[PDB]
Ligand SMILES: Nc1nc2c(ncn2[C@@H]2O[C@H](COP(=O)(O)OP(=O)(O)OP(=O)(O)O)[C@@H](O)[C@H]2O)c(=O)[nH]1
Ligand SMILES: Nc1nc2c(ncn2[C@@H]2O[C@H](COP(=O)(O)OP(=O)(O)O)[C@@H](O)[C@H]2O)c(=O)[nH]1
């Protein structure tokens with residue numbers, strides 16, 4: 001019944017998990033205890049929570065989630081949070097010591113012990129669900145746990161599970177404003193595994209989200225919480241169809257059908273158009289035309305790469321709330337008319353459109369205006385080759401110096417994997433450049 | 441989970457350790473009797489990382505105090521919180537090295553190493569998941585330096601993968617309390633480079649500088665120096681004891697600051713230090729903390745980094761703050777002084793955040809940067825050792841202990857090679 005097993009790796013992943021799960025509980029009005037309170041007793045509004053939650057049969061709805069980490073700190077802060085009783089304790093897996101940004105350490109030494117318990121919990125949650133769409137996996141491809149454990153988990157999911165899905169939400173190392181020195185190596189190896197084992201990899205860069213926040217929300221001092229809540233809004237809009245009825249319904253499986261044209265090229269930017277201060281929306285009309293135009297402004301991309309340098313290969317717009325199909329068609333027409341926006345020739349029809357009646361909720365405490373119309377665009381564009389070449393350049397610097405390779409080699413990782421992944425990335429950017437050209 | 445075994449050896453070692461345990465207790469609100477007195481339950485979520493539990497809820501520091509001058513036992517017992525440590529951990533000789541490295545590394549240290557090895561082994565096996573040991577000592581003295589490097593070699597042979605971090609107090613030609621400081625420092629670092637995971641150097645003259653310029657203290661005593669180094673040391677492992685937004689344990693700092701295994705020397709610093717006079721003037725905010733903790737004066741080493749170039753650097757911020765602010769400050773200082781940072785490293789700064797500040801404080805940073813200026817601070821000791829070794833002064837003191845001149849030759853050559861390595865990776869370009 002449209003079930004979606006969620007996965008979360010690493011500290012970033014688990015913080016995003018907290019965010020998205022607070023958001024979901026607020027959406028379905030599930031009190032922190034886990035008991036959905038009946039409202040007006042006019043009929044049980046079932047079929048809604050079931051996408052993400054699962055009823056234990058006694059009025060307790062537990063989330064179909066699994067949290068994975070090798071450091072017991074953040075997972076315990078989850079345990080000592082407003083949602084302590086909310087999660088079935090088995091799913092909040094933890095390890096004694098962490099990989100410490102050492103992708104290899106988490107990939108061979110530490111992970112290969114907790115991956116078994118995680119796979120067990122996953123098979124459990126799957127045996128529960130009937131008609132599962134696929135798995136969402138949020139992870140920081142910069143950190144050791146995130147990257148490494150995510151690679152291992154995705155490989156195990158690929159081999160053990162059928163064509164269901166694998167949606168990946170990666171917090172890529174921001175191009176300009178980095179946080180760790182070893183980010184290049186972990187990011188590159190994570191990518192080399194990801195491109196093989198993931199269906200869809202929507203990219204996310206904290207730098208771009210910082211810029212979006214200060215530009216629109218005017219929160220000059222954002223924290224990771226605001227970023228988390230923005231990403232939560234995003235993935236909510238991504239699965240709104242699986243829960244709320246609308247004019248057109250886009251199941252998660254349809255992205256991997258539409259957006260990704262070739263098995264290797266499956267990286268995608270994302271954008272969320274109406275993002276306005278509660279006190280600023282007083283001045284905005286928020287027409288669907290305005291939404292659609294703003295969603296294509298390269299500034300509002302959730303990742304940081306300008307598609308004006310690239311080409312839009314495919315786009316998926318998903319609208320929520322007071323949406324009318326006539327205006328949506330008009331807006332996509334006008335956008336196709338624009339010159340700043342260019343589509344590849346061989347893809348003439350570059351749009352998957354979804355329209356869901358459910359207006360996006362507002363979370364108390366997050367600075368976002370109530371709004372009746374929203375969109376989220378997942379776009380596979382050629383400009384992501386820019387960020388990939390950027391990481392290639394940084395990684396090439398470090399590795400031509402052979403800077404930190406000893407750390408990884410100490411973890412039984414054969415150093416040949418480095419050059420192998422770098423050559424794979426060279427081939428990938430070559431693929432992007434190739435498909436960027438028109439036909440002969 | 442991720443336990444720590446503190447190891448202090450030597451007079452300066454014992455003073456540093458005593459002040460350190462005082463500060464860590466003030467951080468956990470533990471009263472010198474041994475019980476808890478705080479108010480935030482968080483203060484107990486990670487309390488096992490440094491203390492073991494004893495019967496009656498009394499928490500006992502997982503410390504191991506060792507020395508060769510038995511008077512230091514009386515010394516540590518004298519100060520407050522001297523009641524904390526369990527006397528079983530106390531290990532002491534009777535003779536004392538007397539500033540002699542060999543005496544504390546061959547003749548006498550070899551006779552206490554067995555006992556302290558038993559003690560550290562018991563403390564380790566008692567703990568389940570050991571992050572590693574945080575040893576602290578001074579290289580100027582004999583017992584500290586010699587016994588410290590001996591036991592460090594031993595424990596490294598016994599626990600290779602665990603972190604073996606060391607706060608070493610290298611003597612400076614500025615203060616030059618003793619005269620055999622060159623031989624001690626040389627014969628210490630020669631093994632330090634071979635066994636230590638990561639090393640923070642601390643120079644008394646640098647601490648005096650900080651206590652005279654940054655702080656304006658009419659009478660800086662060794663107590664105040666120990667206080668500063670304690671504040672630093674606590675700030676190092678802060679993320680291990682408190683949740684924060686982006687965690688960073690010791691191993692994370694290690695991997696993020698060690699390009700090559702022989703370059704494991706950093707220069708620490710503490711951000712919000714301000715004199716009681718200028719305290720009300722300079723407002724407390726993240727850019728101020730950056731400007732300070734990156735001042736060439738504010739470093740706890742005597743090496744001016746301006747001459748050098750930061751290979752990598754890290755910072756740990758205590759207290760709730762905006763991740764965008766700190767990360768933007770990092771990027772800013774990166775793009776501001778690009779000459780001061782190696783080019784082949786894309787982003788040489790590692791940032792971390794814990795949202796629990798030091799008591800009575802709002803925000804505070806603990807900077808740890810691997811530079812090449814340290815190569816200068818080692819050139820100092822190298823030329824000092826060369827001078828006082830050409831004519832073979834005081835050499836008989838060491839040779840009578842079973843040590844031979846070949847040891848001095850190999851030690852000074854190893855230090856020279858380390859210096860050349862740092863020099864190359866400074867001048868190297870990409
Ligand atoms: N968007 C977002 N990213 C985060 C957040 N917290 C951490 N990150 C990302 O996580 C990276 C830090 O590494 P970690 O997430 O700690 O790596 P890990 O998988 O959690 O485990 P370790 O590698 O052992 O640290 C940084 O690059 C951040 O970009 C968060 O709250 N929100
Ligand atoms: N920073 C600092 N240095 C100290 C302190 N006490 C002693 N020292 C230094 O330690 C050196 C002497 O150490 P010593 O007593 O011989 O240690 P030992 O080798 O274990 O006996 C001197 O150069 C002092 O400068 C202190 O409280 N703080």
Ligand SMILES: [Mg+2]
Pocket residue numbers: 010011012098143144145146
């Ligand atoms: Mg992490």
